Design a protein around this ligand. Structure first.
Ligand SMILES: Cc1cc2nc3c(=O)[nH]c(=O)nc-3n(C[C@H](O)[C@H](O)[C@H](O)COP(=O)(O)O)c2cc1C
Ligand SMILES: Cc1cc2nc3c(=O)[nH]c(=O)nc-3n(C[C@H](O)[C@H](O)[C@H](O)COP(=O)(O)O)c2cc1C
Ligand SMILES: Cc1cc2nc3c(=O)[nH]c(=O)nc-3n(C[C@H](O)[C@H](O)[C@H](O)COP(=O)(O)O)c2cc1C
Ligand SMILES: Cc1cc2nc3c(=O)[nH]c(=O)nc-3n(C[C@H](O)[C@H](O)[C@H](O)COP(=O)(O)O)c2cc1C
Lengths: 189, 188, 188, 189
């Protein structure tokens, strides 16, 4: 099974989460895992001065999403929604929608926020788009307990962005990757 | 694989849909399908006076949900949420939650509305509860072609006179067949 | 302006919050505040055996909601939704809906959770129902500084032992005072 | 009271809706009404070939949103969310968020979809962002009935985009503008 971890990060928190997700998915016999980012939409000059952490992963094209059996989407919270960059990317998936290209594929979502507020809404409002594509949606449930959510792995970046993901947050992200990849093998070999 | 179509219905619209869902699921080789309803919470007297439709389906218990590989949940829209009867019932599943009893099982949702507005919120706000249980959620996507990609729906009309259409029931059957197919793929 | 704090609580966490909300609203010159609870739906015997907290607040009726200029609704999180007791109660407001009885009135929501997850969905899925009634919805935004901009919340802890904190109750009082201020501005 | 109708349109459906909203808000004694769009993010070449209807309204800056007492947001549905263009714009409102610049201002939302699916989610997922800004959220309720929603005015563009808004849809949009502007005067004079 092919698993895409597809993400947007501006300050590295989601990027770090993506790595943990991918490590988890890689644990699964039969799963092949790829990590990619959506294009930055900000001019580099502004991205630079805003203190952005330059992202170096291969940039995905909307078309290649059809190639995977499972897609795990990572986005930071922007006032309770996915980021503009992820929204702009997913708005380029009309071709795939028309052809049913993602229909029945596994989808799952992870996020990051400054202080907690909006993490749940970011994940569930992302599930909406995945459901229009006919994707099968995988939440994590009470995994953690067996300041997060049953909807997907999250991390807190802190008010000033200086917090880094904890071992426990990375563990939950890794679990999410492992579990989705396991589902993807059970369904697609 | 074992599939439960669990529904609430007060005027029979969700009941008609539930039957169609159960049929679609039945078409799948390897799938065993049961239809149950959640308990009415209205006193029988007021249900009657409200013009509520009486129903033959057996009443489910909260604890038996753990028996099934896939649960397809049917609720009418009540201002953009599931019904209080469905809500009350699911609030009784804390035991299953604690033991991880529904974790990883498939869930899917269908609904009915008077005039349309709220059918999407009903379905997605029911997904929320399914996700707390760690259920895998199955929307229907563009099979929905106003229906919804989130699951099958029917329009009851403002006075409730309208009955599920051929096309609406056909989408409902699609949904059962789709979820049942996934259940057999995952569980045999 | 008249403000109703309408709440459901099984272990007293939302009850404590409701009191604080009612106080904040009371601080507003021109605001008159009433606290009521929605009916328990559990039989008294099982409520008791469940370790439920008994409550002094008068029980509201669905129809009296139309009396108020602002309603602040308190519910614990039940897998990311309002409680079945709150859901059942609001399902009884079809009469108010038909007559436009709550249209334009202010609504605001607060909640309680065991461990946090679901508090945001509880609040926004309650807003849905308020919007069907045409109520104007008041979130609290960055006064929330894990709380939520959607309305005041408290963490009950996994075993329910934790009680609302000084800070959490202070946000709850802010919310009542804010909504009551808006009610007086709109209605005098 | 100053009322901003702030919108994104790619094929004109939301644009037509915006005009109706603005007409409604203008009916109100004491309300002054302005219509603006968010920047197109698409290169014009692509916008051209996709058959976009060039938008000609003044382009809003994130900063000027602080100047209004009420903002009515219009966006088409993109798989159950606001469009990338509106998301990208609202992601530039961090300055306003930090200063509480939109706190307590009135907000309301209208939408458009191809075939209905996702209109409710687009509106409520937009309310999320408005709530982070502390905005007071105004749905329309059962206005229509006294294929739409109580959350805000909507229009159906049809599967091929050829449908135009009906008189009844425009009437509901106008009502939304009138009602929000009326609220804005009652609160701010
Ligand atoms: C425009 C904008 C909106 C934001 N909204 C929220 C919010 O609603 N809640 C929150 O906790 N943090 C919010 N933040 C903080 C971001 O979520 C945080 O920077 C992000 O999680 C970091 O992830 P990254 O390092 O991968 O970019 C916001 C930040 C920006 C720039
Ligand atoms: C309390 C209550 C709230 C309702 N809210 C809505 C609504 O928000 N939108 C709508 O289109 N219909 C609404 N209706 C109509 C129901 O959705 C409709 O009667 C139901 O779908 C019929 O299904 P059933 O026959 O299976 O009970 C409501 C009905 C009641 C009794
Ligand atoms: C059926 C049920 C479901 C619950 N679901 C959640 C949940 O999803 N997330 C959470 O953090 N707590 C959950 N809890 C804990 C409640 O939110 C907690 O007991 C409540 O907030 C206490 O408020 P009260 O004392 O006012 O009743 C649940 C409790 C019950 C009984
Ligand atoms: C990327 C993309 C995603 C879309 N998703 C949906 C959808 O989920 N539901 C729907 O009915 N229409 C969908 N459509 C149709 C648009 O909503 C429609 O073009 C829009 O409402 C027209 O408004 P405008 O003329 O102002 O651009 C989508 C269109 C595009 C280009």
């Amino acid at each position: 099974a092919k698993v895409l971890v597809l993400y947007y990060s501006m300050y590295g928190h989601i990027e770090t989460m993506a790595r943990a997700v991918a490590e988890g998915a890689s644990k699964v016999d039969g799963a092949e895992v790829v990590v990619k980012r959506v294009p930055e939409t900000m001019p580099p000059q502004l991205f630079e001065k805003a203190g952005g952490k330059t992202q170096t992963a291969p940039v995905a094209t909307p078309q290649e999403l059809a190639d995977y059996d499972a897609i795990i989407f990572g986005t930071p919270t922007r006032f309770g929604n996915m980021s503009g960059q992820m929204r702009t990317f997913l708005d380029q998936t009309g071709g795939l929608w028309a052809s049913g290209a993602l229909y029945g594929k596994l989808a799952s979502v992870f996020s990051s926020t400054g202080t907690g507020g909006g993490q749940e809404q970011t994940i569930t409002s992302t599930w909406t788009t995945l459901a229009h594509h006919g994707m099968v949606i995988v939440p994590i449930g009470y995994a953690a307990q067996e300041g997060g959510t049953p909807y997907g792995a999250t991390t807190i970046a802190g008010g000033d962005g200086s917090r880094q993901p904890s071992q426990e947050e990375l563990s939950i992200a890794r679990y999410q990757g492992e579990y989705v990849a396991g589902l993807a093998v059970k369904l697609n070999g």
